Design an enzyme around this catalytic site. Structure first.
Site, PDB file in Angstrom:
ATOM      1  N   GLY A  13       0.810  -1.204   0.000  1.00  0.00           N
ATOM      2  CA  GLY A  13       0.000   0.000   0.000  1.00  0.00           C
ATOM      3  C   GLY A  13       0.848   1.260   0.000  1.00  0.00           C
ATOM      4  O   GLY A  13       2.075   1.195  -0.078  1.00  0.00           O
ATOM      5  N   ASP A 119      -8.849   8.186  -1.245  1.00  0.00           N
ATOM      6  CA  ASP A 119      -8.069   7.530  -2.284  1.00  0.00           C
ATOM      7  C   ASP A 119      -8.606   6.194  -2.783  1.00  0.00           C
ATOM      8  O   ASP A 119      -8.159   5.137  -2.352  1.00  0.00           O
ATOM      9  CB  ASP A 119      -6.626   7.332  -1.836  1.00  0.00           C
ATOM     10  CG  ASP A 119      -5.749   6.808  -2.957  1.00  0.00           C
ATOM     11  OD1 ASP A 119      -5.464   7.580  -3.894  1.00  0.00           O
ATOM     12  OD2 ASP A 119      -5.355   5.624  -2.915  1.00  0.00           O
TER      13      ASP A 119
HETATM   14  C1  LIG Z   1      -3.797  -2.927  -1.112  1.00  0.00           C
HETATM   15  C2  LIG Z   1      -4.751  -3.778  -0.300  1.00  0.00           C
HETATM   16  N1  LIG Z   1      -5.402  -3.348   0.778  1.00  0.00           N
HETATM   17  C3  LIG Z   1      -6.190  -4.357   1.283  1.00  0.00           C
HETATM   18  C4  LIG Z   1      -7.007  -4.036   2.530  1.00  0.00           C
HETATM   19  C5  LIG Z   1      -6.128  -5.571   0.598  1.00  0.00           C
HETATM   20  C6  LIG Z   1      -6.773  -6.842   0.741  1.00  0.00           C
HETATM   21  C7  LIG Z   1      -7.856  -7.055   1.635  1.00  0.00           C
HETATM   22  C8  LIG Z   1      -8.420  -8.344   1.680  1.00  0.00           C
HETATM   23  N2  LIG Z   1      -7.944  -9.323   0.922  1.00  0.00           N
HETATM   24  C9  LIG Z   1      -6.912  -9.049   0.133  1.00  0.00           C
HETATM   25  N3  LIG Z   1      -6.358 -10.063  -0.717  1.00  0.00           N
HETATM   26  C10 LIG Z   1      -6.201 -10.061  -2.131  1.00  0.00           C
HETATM   27  N4  LIG Z   1      -5.692 -11.046  -2.746  1.00  0.00           N
HETATM   28  O1  LIG Z   1      -5.248 -12.179  -2.253  1.00  0.00           O
HETATM   29  N5  LIG Z   1      -6.335  -7.872   0.006  1.00  0.00           N
HETATM   30  S1  LIG Z   1      -5.045  -5.397  -0.750  1.00  0.00           S
END
Ligand SMILES: Cc1nc(C)c(-c2ccnc(N/C=N\O)n2)s1
Length: 290
Positions: A13, A119
């Site tokens: 992130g 964002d």
């Molecule tokens: C950038 C991201 N921020 C969050 C909160 C993400 C997230 C949340 C829940 N599950 C996942 N997984 C995605 N692929 O495996 N990714 S990815």
């Protein structure tokens, strides 16, 4: 913190990398984001009480020796990826329409409690095999912000940033989110980003060359904004028929309103749900390759 066993890296992130994590205790699969002051905590802690079927749940907040840990529910895929995986064919309209419907449902909820995302990008939108899509990292912009680069030693994305923000307005509302979503919507339909600007000025001008250069006629007070420059090139508004083809009139109308320069003229979440475009809204199922 020693209650989780890392599995893999879901991604990075703007303020912390995301890891898929095994919960030694419950044994549940969760999204763990590592990231500090007290104000933030009180804030991000307040987000724990905020829950909606389309808002990616912030299970628990963990703060250890000035090292913040966000524990979120896990979803196997984000829209950015699903799109890359559908570039050749393209997401079916029924899925686009539902994805937008649910997204606004969520937006409507957050905004209702006056919580902005600041964002939104495909990468922060998650989907499941069951046909649902949720907003992630919502309300996190309030807690902290963004450096000159990022934690991953890189740079964020301006592509979905509203003009008021790009122009210097420091007190922006929920309207900014509707702008981002509207951009996303457009990307889903054309399979290409709407305003892939590579700098604030490129971002702005790219926006200008499509919706025309704003002024007091369409955006009252626009010239009094901090970064507004009288010397801006005066472009003409391009036909929306050339922007999101082959989307129908209901789409073009709804989109047009999500992209109004004047934030206060811009269509609201609650309102967008009643727009003719969702007259034939259903709940198709995606076809993700896990
Ligand atoms: C950038 C991201 N921020 C969050 C909160 C993400 C997230 C949340 C829940 N599950 C996942 N997984 C995605 N692929 O495996 N990714 S990815």
């Amino acid at each position: 913190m020693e209650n989780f066993q890392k599995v893999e890296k879901i991604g990075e992130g703007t303020y912390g990398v995301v890891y898929k994590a095994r919960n030694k205790l419950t044994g549940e699969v969760v999204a763990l984001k590592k990231i500090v002051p007290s104000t933030a905590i009180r804030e991000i802690s307040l987000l724990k009480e905020l829950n909606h079927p389309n808002i990616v749940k912030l299970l628990d907040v963990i703060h250890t020796e000035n090292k913040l840990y966000l524990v979120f529910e896990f979803l196997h895929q984000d829209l950015k990826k699903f799109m890359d995986a559908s570039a050749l064919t393209g997401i079916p309209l029924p899925l686009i329409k539902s994805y937008l419907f649910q997204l606004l449902q969520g937006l409507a909820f957050c905004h209702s409690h006056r919580v902005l995302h600041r964002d939104l990008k495909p990468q922060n939108l998650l989907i499941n095999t069951e046909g649902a899509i949720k907003l992630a990292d919502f309300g996190l912009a309030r807690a902290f912000g963004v450096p000159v680069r990022t934690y991953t030693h890189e740079v964020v994305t301006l592509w979905y940033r509203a003009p008021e923000i790009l122009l210097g307005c420091k007190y922006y509302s929920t309207a900014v989110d509707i702008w981002s979503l509207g951009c996303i919507f457009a990307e889903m339909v054309t399979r290409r980003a709407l305003f892939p600007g590579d700098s604030e000025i490129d971002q702005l001008f790219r926006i200008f060359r499509t919706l025309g250069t704003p002024d007091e006629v369409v955006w009252p007070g626009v010239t009094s904004m901090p970064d507004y420059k009288p010397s801006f090139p005066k472009w003409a508004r391009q036909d929306f028929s050339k922007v999101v083809p082959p989307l129908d009139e209901d789409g073009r109308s709804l989109l047009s309103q999500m992209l109004h320069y004047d934030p206060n003229k811009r269509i609201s979440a609650k309102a967008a749900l009643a727009h003719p475009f969702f007259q034939d809204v259903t709940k198709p199922v995606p076809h993700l390759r896990l």
